[PDB]
Each structure stands twice: as C-alpha cells, then as structure tokens.
C-alpha cells in the first residue's frame, strides 16, 4: 500500500547525494558530517513512519541531537528549516510524479505533513531549551 | 477559481474564532492581542495568496514583527511553529472537506505549503537574526 515508500527505500541513497546538493552546509560547520547522517537516519525513521512501523515520538531522540549540534555550529536554526524543507519537497515530487489517486495522495500528504511538522517543531524547541 | 478562498473569506471571523482556542497564548503575554491581529492579516495575505494576488516576499516584514513581539514575550519560539500549524491543518481540513479534484487539490497544497513554509522559516530566521 505505498510505492512512495519503495521508491525511496531503494533510493535512499541517490535522495541523500541529491539532497545534499541541495542544502545549507557551511564548511565551517564542526558537524558537517553529521548533518548528512542525520538525514540518513531520519530518511528512514520516514520509511517506517509511512508504513506505521515507528511512532513520531521515536524521531524526538534525533530531533534532540540536531539541535546541540545546531547550538555548537553556532548557526541560525532556520537553516535547518530550509534544509528538512528542500528534503520534503523532493518527497513531494516524488509522490506526484508516482501519480497515486486522490484518496492514497491525501493519506500521504497527512503521514508527510505529520512527519516532518514533528522534527521542525521539535527541532526548534529543543534548540531554544537546550541555548536556554 | 478557488472556493477554499471564497470559503475562508465568508468565515475569516469563525475560522479565527476556532483558532484562538486551539493555540498556545498566554494571559501574561505581553502581545497577547497582536498575535490575533497579526493571524487576521495572515489569513487574509494567505487567501491573496492563493489568488496570485500578492508573492511571498510580501509576508516577510510581518514575519519580522512577529519575531519581535516573540523575543520581548520571551517564550519559546516553536509556540509560534505551533500556533501556525494549527491554522494549517485547519486549512487543510477545510480543503478536505471541499471536494476538490485531484489536479485541484496538488496545486492548492502546493500554494499552502509554500506559505506556510515562508512563513515559519522566515519568523525563525528573523527571530535568532534579531536576538544575536
Ligand atoms: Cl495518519
Ligand atoms: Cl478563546
Ligand atoms: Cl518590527
């Protein structure tokens, strides 16, 4: 019940060197690397999620881990908003160009929106709890 | 061409209305009454928006007010990430309910994700910009 969910799988690593690309990484940053396996990991955290497999609460540990690392590389933590963002419109493109119908797009649309509400909300609160 | 604009234009007061009691505000915030003032205006630069009445750029002098008004509430700034997901999902819903065709639908969720994107990651951005 989800090609969506194939397709990335199989993808993962063509997503991840394309989406890279694509981001705000500052040379600079003592947690370039870790930027990249973050999004590995919660690449897959999606997987699972679109299949039902993993609750939200289960990316939180993540979510907390960008955010120390966000406070150290001493950057503005809306980057890290544009960078989850660049990563949710390629999903989206992805779901439309598989071109499922209306029913399984808005039950997508709801598990993606859910997703990825969750890492930037949480995201940005941890940063402002943790710098507290 | 849009009666999910039509439709939040008749029921701007309402939809407000259902709103305020959904989101995270306090008594003691000292900009309590501007975060209703600055939703109004919101919606109405939303349903703009989706008219192709006003670009994007356009939300960003009310982004940065907002993130001033948060830094002197001095709450945590995913509160608003919060506050304006509730109105997003409540759109969301409304389209929903509205029964659009697929192709209507793609293209509409595309106009709400594009604004409400902009809108958080503008406010967040200006937020840490302004605070230092
Ligand atoms: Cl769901
Ligand atoms: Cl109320
Ligand atoms: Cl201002």
Same mark, same amino acid.
């Given at each position: ?5 194939? @397709? /990335? =799988? !199989? ?10 690309? +694509?981001? &705000?990484? %500052? $040379? *600079? ?19 699972? @999620? /679109? =299949? !039902? ?10 979510? +907390?881990? &960008?955010? %120390? $690392? *966000? ?62």
């Amino acid at each position: 019940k989800c090609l969506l969910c194939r @397709y /990335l =799988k !199989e993808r993962q690593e063509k997503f991840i060197s394309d989406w890279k690309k +694509k981001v &705000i990484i %500052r $040379e *600079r940053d003592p947690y370039k690397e870790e930027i990249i396996k973050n999004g590995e990991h919660l690449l897959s955290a999606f997987i699972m @999620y /679109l =299949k !039902e497999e993993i609750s939200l609460q289960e990316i939180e540990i993540t979510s +907390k881990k &960008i955010a %120390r $690392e *966000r406070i150290d590389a001493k950057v503005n933590i809306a980057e890290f908003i544009h960078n989850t963002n660049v990563a949710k419109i390629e999903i989206m493109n992805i779901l439309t160009l598989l071109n499922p119908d209306l029913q399984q797009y808005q039950a997508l649309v709801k598990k993606i929106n859910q997703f990825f509400d969750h890492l930037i909300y949480y995201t940005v609160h941890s940063y402002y709890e943790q710098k507290a």
